[PDB]
Write a protein that binds this ligand. Structure first.
Ligand SMILES: C=C1[C@H](O)CC(=C/C=C2\CCC[C@]3(C)[C@@H]([C@@H](C)/C=C/C[C@@H](O)[C@]45C[C@H]6C[C@H](C[C@H](C6)C4)C5)CC[C@@H]23)C[C@H]1O
Lengths: 242, 11
């Protein structure tokens, strides 16, 4: 019979708190980003560079609180974060994404981002179309916050990331998170919403790999132009590539 | 590849 152990309940509590400590639903800090410009030769690049850089900082903060993550070597923590950062940003952004107008709504017209805004940061439909598809499919899962933070943590602690040294340790940590998620869904998610839910969640991890691949290709092209690179933040340059 | 800022944020 499915039963969330005390430990699994503890893992969930820790991750919910970690998320609450690293995701501000008032988006107050957004006022401090370089201003968004919607007229446009990459007019949204400065604002979205800052939104992404900010988000990388928060993902790192969330990652550090994942049970087990601190047990990893510095090298492995770095590899896992560089590879997962954009995917976790895609995942965590689903909180602001709305299917009303298919945009990321962060509390005002200024900080409401649609497909044209993302295009004005340099990205093309090769990435943007499937990204919206992803946000829609993820939103429709109607995840509990418990499942949302578990999925972000499972995403970060992935054994198969390029450059991972101690794959076994990473796998052990992820398995503990996965089993927590699987047990949570069985015990705590009522039907029909729970139907095929874990499988659908794990499929989203596969979708994220493809989005990650395309993002990396487009980031390389965009960051190749020094006049774009001068407008990036140092953290973005370090994590995504310099 | 050396990541000063990432490394510092992880400490
Ligand atoms: C706090 C949060 C969440 O964290 C996230 C929130 C919103 C999330 C959004 C809406 C905007 C575009 C996002 C980030 C997409 C991404 C693929 C594009 C990144 C651009 C990026 O690749 C860029 C391209 C070049 C110019 C510049 C500098 C560099 C070169 C790098 C930006 C995926 C999720 C999308 C708001 C709130 O919910």
């Amino acid at each position: 019979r499915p039963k969330l152990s005390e430990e699994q309940q503890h893992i969930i509590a820790i991750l919910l708190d970690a998320h609450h400590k690293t995701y501000d639903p008032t988006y107050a800090d957004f006022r401090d980003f370089r201003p968004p410009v919607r007229m446009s030769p990459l007019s949204m690049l400065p604002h979205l560079a800052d939104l992404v850089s900010y988000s990388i900082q928060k993902v790192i903060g969330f990652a550090k609180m994942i049970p087990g993550f601190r047990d990893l070597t510095s090298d492995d923590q770095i590899v896992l974060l560089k590879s997962s950062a954009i995917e976790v940003i895609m995942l965590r952004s689903n909180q602001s994404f709305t299917m009303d107008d298919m945009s990321w709504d962060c509390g005002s017209q200024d900080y409401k981002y649609d497909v044209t805004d993302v295009s004005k940061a340099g990205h093309t439909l090769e990435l943007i179309e499937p990204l919206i598809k992803f946000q829609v499919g993820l939103k429709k899962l109607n995840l509990h916050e418990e499942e949302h933070v578990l999925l972000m943590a499972i995403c970060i602690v992935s054994p198969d990331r390029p450059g991972v040294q101690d794959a076994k340790l990473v796998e052990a940590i992820q398995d503990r998170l996965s089993n927590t998620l699987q047990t949570y869904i069985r015990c705590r998610h009522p039907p029909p919403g729970s139907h095929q839910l874990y499988a659908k969640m794990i499929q989203k991890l596969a979708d994220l790999r493809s989005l990650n691949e395309e993002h990396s290709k487009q980031y390389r092209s965009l960051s190749f132009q020094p006049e774009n690179s001068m407008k990036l933040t140092p953290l973005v340059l370090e994590v995504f590539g310099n | 590849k050396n990541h000063p800022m990432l490394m510092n944020l992880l400490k």
